Amino acid sequence: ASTDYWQNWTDGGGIVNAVNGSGGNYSVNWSNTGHFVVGKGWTTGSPFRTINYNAGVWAPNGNGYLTLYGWTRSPLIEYYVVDSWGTYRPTGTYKGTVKSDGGTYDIYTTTRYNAPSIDGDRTTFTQYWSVRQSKRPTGSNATITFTNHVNAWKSHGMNLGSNWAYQVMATEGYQSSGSSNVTVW
Numbered sequence: 324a325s326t327d328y329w330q331n332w333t334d335g336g337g338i339v340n341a342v343n344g345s346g347g348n349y350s351v352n353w354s355n356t357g358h359f360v361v362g363k364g365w366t367t368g369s370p371f372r373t374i375n376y377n378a379g380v381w382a383p384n385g386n387g388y389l390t391l392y393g394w395t396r397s398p399l400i401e402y403y404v405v406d407s408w409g410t411y412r413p414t415g416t417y418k419g420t421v422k423s424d425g426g427t428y429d430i431y432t433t434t435r436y437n438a439p440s441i442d443g444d445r446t447t448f449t450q451y452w453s454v455r456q457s458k459r460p461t462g463s464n465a466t467i468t469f470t471n472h473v474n475a476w477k478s479h480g481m482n483l484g485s486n487w488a489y490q491v492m493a494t495e496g497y498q499s500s501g502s503s504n505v506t507v508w
């Protein structure tokens with residue numbers, strides 16, 4: 324699919340050099356950052372979407388995630404399917420596991436209080452996570468069958484909102500540097 328959305332958020336720390344490339348392609352070169360999330364995807368997420376990507380460069384030098392990333396409202400939820408990371412594997416309150424697309428993911432919840440969201444600078448929301456138990460290889464075509472995650476999350480009382488906002492294959496970083504280049508379809 325053609326991507327129709329460009330995600331490019333930074334809280335303003337350090338430098339985030341985000342390139343909105345051709346088609347579903349983007350690149351990030353980041354340095355000594357605060358918090359940021361950059362990616363390509365779709366303006367309106369769907370629990371039925373199958374996201375394909377190829378991370379031609381996955382080169383974090385510190386804390387970074389290579390992850391499906393998106394939001395719902397009603398309720399406000401930020402969600403993740405993390406396939407790779409840098410120095411630190413993201414974790415939270417363990418709920419169970421789901422197997423999907425050749426990997427086994429732990430299912431976590433965490434919460435943010437008075438934090439930035441699509442609803443404002445200072446808001447409170449639950450974060451839903453599938454995090455691969457070990458890093459997915461990069462450089463070849465990879466699929467995230469998002470419906471497997473949605474259903475597994477439901478089985479653990481993690482229900483997504485009825486109002487879907489954007490849904491992207493992202494590079495997120497925190498207090499780190501690195502490079503990425505990713506193509507999404």
Ligand SMILES: *[C@H]1OC[C@@H](O[C@@H]2OC[C@@H](O)[C@H](O)[C@H]2O)[C@H](O)[C@H]1F
Binds near residue numbers: 358359439450
């Ligand atoms: C998950 O990722 C980073 C941040 O989400 C941003 O919030 C502000 C909004 O305008 C952007 O589109 C989001 O990327 C959130 O605090 C964190 F929980």
